[PDB]
Amino acid sequence: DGQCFLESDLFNQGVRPAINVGVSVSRVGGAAQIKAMKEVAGSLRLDLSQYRELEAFAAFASDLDAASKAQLDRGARLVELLKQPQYSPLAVEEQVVAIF
Amino acid sequence: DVFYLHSRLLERCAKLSDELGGGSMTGLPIIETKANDISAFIPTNVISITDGQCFLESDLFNQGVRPAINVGVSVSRVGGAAQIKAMKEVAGSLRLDLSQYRELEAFAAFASDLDAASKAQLDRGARLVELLKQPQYSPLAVEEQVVAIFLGTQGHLDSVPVEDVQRFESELLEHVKASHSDIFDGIRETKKLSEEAEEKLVSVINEFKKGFQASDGSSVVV
Amino acid sequence: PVGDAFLGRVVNPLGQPIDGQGDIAAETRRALELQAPSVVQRQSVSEPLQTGIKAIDAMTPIGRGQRQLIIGDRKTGKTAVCVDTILNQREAWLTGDPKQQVRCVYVAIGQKGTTIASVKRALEEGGAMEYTTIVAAPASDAAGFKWLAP
Amino acid sequence: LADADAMHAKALADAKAESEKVTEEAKQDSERIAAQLSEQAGSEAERIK
Amino acid sequence: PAIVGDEHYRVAQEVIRILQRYKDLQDIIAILGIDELSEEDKQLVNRARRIERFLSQNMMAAEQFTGQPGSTVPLKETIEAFDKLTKGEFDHLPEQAFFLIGGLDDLAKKAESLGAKL
Amino acid sequence: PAIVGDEHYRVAQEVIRILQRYKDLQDIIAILGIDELSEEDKQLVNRARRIERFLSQNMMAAEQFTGQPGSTVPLKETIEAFDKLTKGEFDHLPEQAFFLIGGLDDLAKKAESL
Amino acid sequence: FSLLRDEGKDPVLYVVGRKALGYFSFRQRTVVESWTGFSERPTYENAREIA
Amino acid sequence: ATLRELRGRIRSAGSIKKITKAQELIATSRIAKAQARVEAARPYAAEITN
Amino acid sequence: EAMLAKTAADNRKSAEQVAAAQADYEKEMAEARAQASALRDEARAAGRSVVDEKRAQASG
Ligand SMILES: Nc1ncnc2c1ncn2[C@@H]1O[C@H](COP(=O)(O)OP(=O)(O)OP(=O)(O)O)[C@@H](O)[C@H]1O
Ligand SMILES: [Mg+2]
């Protein structure tokens, strides 16, 4: 019912857990989340997929429109937020606040 | 014996000698490639067996080139022996022109930098590629094909915008068929384009150009 | 069975009609594995076979007695080219001269029945059924029929 | 100035005449196309019947 | 054209052509960047990105995965919207405005929410 | 050189080098135009054109198409002729003079014909 | 810059073109003025303004 | 799927090669133009120097 | 002085009228050609409608 794809390239970049957001999916979706988490993380996966697409696309763009730059900034911050060390669990409420 | 299967099937398509009545059977086998892998076993066998290949490609089809035949790699070993004299004359320069156009396509946006010859070749190739496009379920008679290729290869489409070429051709072919069918009749009966027929066709083309309208409101005369 | 009565009919690899139009009067019978014309029983291919497609007729012309492969990925327009050739043969048919008339045989191997029906409708719309025979071995037919249809 | 005005008027009249001729040709071509397409439709009606 | 009509067929073919050209140019954009493309190719790339985003849609069955209610677009509206897109009439809107929406009204509302006017 | 001789190898290598440089300059000729090239480039283009047209020959099998018969150039004659050509000793002659001929005698005969 | 600093001076920086602008932006060196958009084909007016 | 990605990379490299070759030829022409402009500018520099 | 000014103005007017003759000629001919093309296109469309309607009637 879905898979968490882990990549060594992402792992070496500091993305821990090295979950490939684009091709990782849960087939249950919001039904497996509490209401608060579903509210604060409704479109996080799609947002990060679009962010990775834009980051690849705008790798060598000399000048970027304001919207694209804002999207890149938001995606970079979200990627940093999702990073988590091993043996450092977060309670569901703490995760909700962080994603908020 | 799969190669034997196909080869024994396809060698029955033959042009019989006059002693046997002169009959003939022409084979048009179809092969479906996967991911355009003409190196697969059965495509390789059938390619080795046949006298020529028409390679159709998905990228060409999506580009609007329909029929999506890749003229660069498509071949016919019989060649001009299977053409009438008029088609041989008009279609002589098509291959080299299209090859040069494919070479020059990289410089589409640098036409100003290109010398006169290169820009002329680019424009001619674009017009010829537009000319070879054809709608489905609409085959053309040999005389109409000769006249269209004559338009393409004699520079009569040089003044026509690329986006209009197709339409132009069609309308022109209509106009002749309604007022100067003697050109088509001459081509069909003699299988060659006579000098008088050629000059009459040129005059008809010029008058029609006087009458034709580009989609962008420009003029196609001269 | 073989004969002029097969023009305009859809038959299975055994020659049995499957179009529901009744029996086919067979002129004679031909074994499927008769040898091809020998090397000294032929002559050079010289008569054009006009497909009506400018690209083919100008770049890769096809002569009568030639074997021209139509090769490409799916949905690239191969059946369209072949059907266009068959339709183009209609003026030659109407000429009435056997030296110009071209009789068409469309062999469908592994296609779904509705696709064969669509091809037949396309041929009828252009009046090509008058001089065209269809040998059909749809996907539901046994592997032997698909093997023997050509 | 007088000769230029006279030549301009002559050109205007010639333009009138040539426009009339070309629109006449357009009328003939339009009627011919209508008749030919009607004939084609009738022939296809015969084929359908 | 015979079944769906000339307009639908033409719009679909134009969309396919633009997307095919964009697919061809993707590698060049990745390596050398968009700034090395011809002006017409830059225009086509922007149009293609907007078109590919607009082909996406919020589905009724997808809510469980996104929380966004689905939408339905009539065929006439789809044809008109993609005709407008293929002509560059929405080139001034950000591409994000075209992502996971319905018709042109949804496009206008999302563009307004993103700081642009349709 | 151990097989065909040193002179043969030297002449062949010179011909190959000239033809390769001409092939390299072909793209510039085609797009930027011939005049865009330097003077040495033009000299080498002329010499390479003459060399490449001289590699053509009137074949025996071609006699069935054109009435002219075929030619057989002895190896020494070919070596010396192409050595002279690479040195630019025939660069002034017209290009057509190097089409479908045999050795140097045929070259001179066709040169006088033009 | 190293030579000038060894000569007891301070460099006041002006830039023509965008690549140098990006380089010095990364280095955080201040650029008093920058002119861009004519490096490929400069006219006398640009040189006059710079001078 | 190694072969598929290899073919995709071959296509990408071919496109990059075509673009780079075109840019190289355009740069040759632009060098010609720039040298012509330098030559055109020379005489005024000489006269003003004198 | 008025005669000199009028001579200059009349030379300019003669030049501009010799130009405007051709300009109006081209404009009117473009209009007539556009009318002809529109007539031909609408005739073709009407014939297409005729054939399609006859197809539907024959099918019925
Ligand atoms: N010349 C053409 N112009 C426009 N559309 C065409 C043309 N030829 C074919 N098509 C369309 O392309 C699509 C594929 O055509 P076709 O079925 O003949 O291809 P194919 O390669 O035989 O397909 P398949 O894999 O289904 O056997 C169909 O929609 C057909 O209408
Ligand atoms: Mg098919």
Short mmCIF file of N, CA and C in Angstrom, two decimals, chain B residues 9 14 20 23 26 41 46 48 78 81 98 119 126 138 142 157 166 178-179 182 192 196 204 220:
data_model
loop_
_atom_site.label_atom_id
_atom_site.label_comp_id
_atom_site.label_asym_id
_atom_site.label_seq_id
_atom_site.Cartn_x
_atom_site.Cartn_y
_atom_site.Cartn_z
N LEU B 9 7.64 -16.41 -47.01
CA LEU B 9 6.42 -15.66 -47.26
C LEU B 9 6.66 -14.53 -48.25
N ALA B 14 6.65 -11.12 -56.32
CA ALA B 14 7.61 -11.03 -57.41
C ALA B 14 6.96 -10.39 -58.62
N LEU B 20 5.52 -15.65 -68.34
CA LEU B 20 4.53 -16.12 -67.38
C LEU B 20 3.34 -15.19 -67.25
N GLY B 23 2.49 -10.78 -64.68
CA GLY B 23 1.84 -10.38 -63.45
C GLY B 23 2.84 -10.06 -62.36
N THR B 26 2.91 -7.09 -55.09
CA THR B 26 3.70 -6.14 -54.31
C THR B 26 3.39 -6.34 -52.84
N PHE B 41 15.02 -8.84 -33.21
CA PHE B 41 15.27 -10.00 -34.06
C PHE B 41 14.38 -9.98 -35.30
N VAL B 46 13.15 -8.99 -41.13
CA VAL B 46 12.27 -8.47 -42.18
C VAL B 46 12.96 -7.35 -42.94
N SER B 48 16.19 -7.16 -43.48
CA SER B 48 17.11 -7.84 -44.38
C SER B 48 16.38 -8.47 -45.56
N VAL B 78 14.83 -0.39 -55.20
CA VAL B 78 14.39 -0.25 -56.58
C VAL B 78 14.60 1.19 -57.05
N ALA B 81 13.70 3.44 -60.70
CA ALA B 81 13.11 2.50 -61.64
C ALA B 81 11.62 2.32 -61.41
N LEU B 98 16.47 17.88 -48.40
CA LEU B 98 16.02 17.55 -47.06
C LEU B 98 17.19 17.21 -46.14
N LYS B 119 20.66 30.16 -45.64
CA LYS B 119 19.31 30.60 -45.33
C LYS B 119 18.32 30.13 -46.39
N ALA B 126 12.30 23.81 -45.02
CA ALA B 126 11.09 23.95 -44.23
C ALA B 126 9.85 23.83 -45.12
N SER B 138 -6.52 10.41 -47.86
CA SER B 138 -6.53 11.31 -49.01
C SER B 138 -5.30 11.07 -49.87
N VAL B 142 -0.87 10.58 -59.36
CA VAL B 142 0.54 10.80 -59.67
C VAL B 142 0.75 12.18 -60.28
N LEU B 157 7.16 27.83 -53.81
CA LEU B 157 6.72 27.99 -52.43
C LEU B 157 7.64 28.91 -51.63
N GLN B 166 0.91 24.08 -47.04
CA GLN B 166 -0.09 23.04 -47.23
C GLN B 166 -1.33 23.61 -47.91
N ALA B 178 -9.75 22.50 -61.80
CA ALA B 178 -10.99 23.12 -62.24
C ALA B 178 -10.83 23.95 -63.49
N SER B 179 -9.61 24.36 -63.85
CA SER B 179 -9.41 25.28 -64.96
C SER B 179 -8.30 24.88 -65.91
N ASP B 182 -5.72 20.19 -68.38
CA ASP B 182 -4.86 19.73 -69.46
C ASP B 182 -3.44 19.44 -68.98
N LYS B 192 5.44 12.49 -68.38
CA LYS B 192 6.51 13.47 -68.28
C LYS B 192 5.88 14.86 -68.33
N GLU B 196 6.07 23.00 -72.67
CA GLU B 196 4.87 23.82 -72.80
C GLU B 196 3.98 23.66 -71.58
N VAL B 204 0.05 29.64 -64.52
CA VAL B 204 -1.10 29.39 -63.66
C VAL B 204 -0.73 29.61 -62.20
N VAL B 220 1.74 36.79 -51.32
CA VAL B 220 2.63 35.72 -51.75
C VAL B 220 3.13 35.93 -53.17
#
